[PDB]
Amino acid sequence: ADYQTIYTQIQARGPHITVSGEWGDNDRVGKPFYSYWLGKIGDAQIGPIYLGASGIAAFAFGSTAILIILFNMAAEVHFDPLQFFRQFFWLGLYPPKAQYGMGIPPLHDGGWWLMAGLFMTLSLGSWWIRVYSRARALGLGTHIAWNFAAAIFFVLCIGCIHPTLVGSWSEGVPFGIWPHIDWLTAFSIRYGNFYYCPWHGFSIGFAYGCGLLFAAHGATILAVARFGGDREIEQITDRGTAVERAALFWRWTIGFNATIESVHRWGWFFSLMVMVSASVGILLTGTFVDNWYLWCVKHGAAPDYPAYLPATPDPASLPGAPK
């Protein structure tokens, strides 16, 4: 088998290349250093890193957020450092627990949450500009920036757009390792089991799809590494045996196939779709659906099983039956 697929047997070193952008070639700072071990499975060169205005802004806003969280968290273990390092995962900055609606809640109850929310939004936006313009500056398409927009949107949805639509800040995601995980369940429970939200399904469908695709696509390229399948741009502009054999693999296997360029469109789409689908579902939840399960029951799709232990009537609606 082609060992070159596993790791790079013989590394090469040469002068570090630079491709000149339409601006901020002066903002690239750094001493581009190499790395023998990183070279076995990747490119040895690390740096230099491009700064720029937007990149810095991101870090400003970003850390303001991190500080606002990390501080509320240190506060949560009464500023004792050893306990903070111990209970880290369990600590969180939460949104307003009481119902204040869309009014700005007090700092002691989701005030700080709303704050860090805003700064993370600001950070995310900034970073987008960087991702967007870097493509411009280098004379490249803006596919990455558009895809990244989907992701940012979805965050806004579960962050505040949804809370807004149902009109309550209490609905947003808590900042924190376990606490943001807990929200997943509190939210699924509240809206009648996300397994039953079709967009949840679409999002999951695509996310597994990306799993399938990248697994397949990557394997394919490695399987045609001996013909330089890796050299994708030129296989696009000048098809070669590499992508011919790739294509004929799939065609002989599943009955159709793509082109070395098109597949990246499939890939790009599926990715994009995970976030678009996620967003569509979240938008509907609470706004136009209250119990996803019952909703599938209404349209007759939810399945049913016979009883195993005896069926059990809600005792709350028995004649008798207290408060």
């Binding site: 398409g141 990306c210 697994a215 696509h217 394919t220 001996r226 004929l248 990246h264 799709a301």
Partner: protein, 273 residues
């Protein structure tokens, strides 16, 4: 019928078993010994599914569910209507998945390429065995498998996870999730990048490998390279199941409390207890 360039590649040979006997195409499809066995298994399976679905209560594709036997049956054969079909169908899907993978090997051999695809395809097949065979074996009954049904299998995933109070805290799951997420993101970037380079638009000029790497070096200080992103991809995605399998195999046979509690090893080091 053939692609503009396909004719030259259509030679005899590459098979693992049979030789010339099944060495031919039918439409775009390569057959081979394993295409034959694959077809046999797919036919039985879909039949069994279709036929067992017919003793079911419904024909709505979303509600049809064919389920394994009750726990009490252990590892022995169960009556058809009580999870026998499920057991047959399970054997069929395994025969199919394997034929399919082995067939892909013959195809890569004819084409003189890597076996990387059928190999990567073992990951999904493996995880399916963890769910329907290995874990069930470890807990002593096929009754532990998931039911075949578009929505109903979600019901099983649901309940299986709540059997452990909060499956999110399962460390094998935390791993797997993170790979799932990051992989979807990588496919976004990689697919996006190539497209961003062959399609700058405005009839600007197609760019270079140099440009690819330049892009990421700029945005995040590093760029893994072309052949490298492909390997990293296969790795990220394969790990969704390779690490996830531990989280699954562990729930029951190796751990019976909620997962949150499992984090006691950390929370409860006497030192900071």
């Amino acid at each position: 019928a053939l692609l503009s360039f396909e004719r030259k590649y259509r030679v005899r040979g590459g098979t693992l078993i049979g030789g010339d006997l099944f060495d031919f195409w039918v439409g775009p499809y390569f057959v081979g010994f394993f295409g034959v066995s694959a077809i046999f298994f797919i036919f039985l399976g879909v039949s069994l599914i279709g036929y067992a679905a017919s003793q079911g209560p419904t024909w709505d594709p979303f509600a049809i569910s064919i389920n394994p036997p009750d726990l009490k049956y252990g590892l022995g054969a169960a009556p058809l209507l009580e999870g026998g079909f499920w057991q047959a169908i399970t054997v069929c899907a395994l025969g199919a998945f394997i034929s399919w993978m082995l067939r892909e090997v013959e195809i890569s051999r004819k084409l003189g390429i890597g076996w990387h695809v059928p190999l990567a395809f073992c990951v999904p097949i493996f995880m399916f065995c963890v769910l329907q065979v290995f874990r069930p074996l470890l807990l002593g009954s096929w009754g532990h498998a998931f039911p075949y049904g578009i929505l109903s299998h979600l019901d099983w995933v649901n309940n299986f996870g709540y059997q452990y109070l909060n499956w999110h805290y399962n460390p094998g799951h935390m791993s797997s999730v993170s790979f799932l997420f990051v992989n979807a993101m990588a496919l976004g970037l990689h697919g996006g990048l190539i497209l961003s380079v062959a399609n700058p638009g405005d009839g600007d000029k197609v760019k270079t490998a140099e440009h690819e790497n330049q892009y990421f070096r700029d945005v995040v200080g590093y760029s893994i390279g072309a052949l490298s992103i492909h390997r990293l991809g296969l790795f990220l995605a394969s790990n969704i199941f390779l690490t996830g399998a531990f989280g699954t195999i562990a729930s029951g046979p190796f751990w019976t409390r909620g997962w949150p509690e499992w984090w006691g090893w950390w929370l409860d080091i006497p030192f900071w207890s």
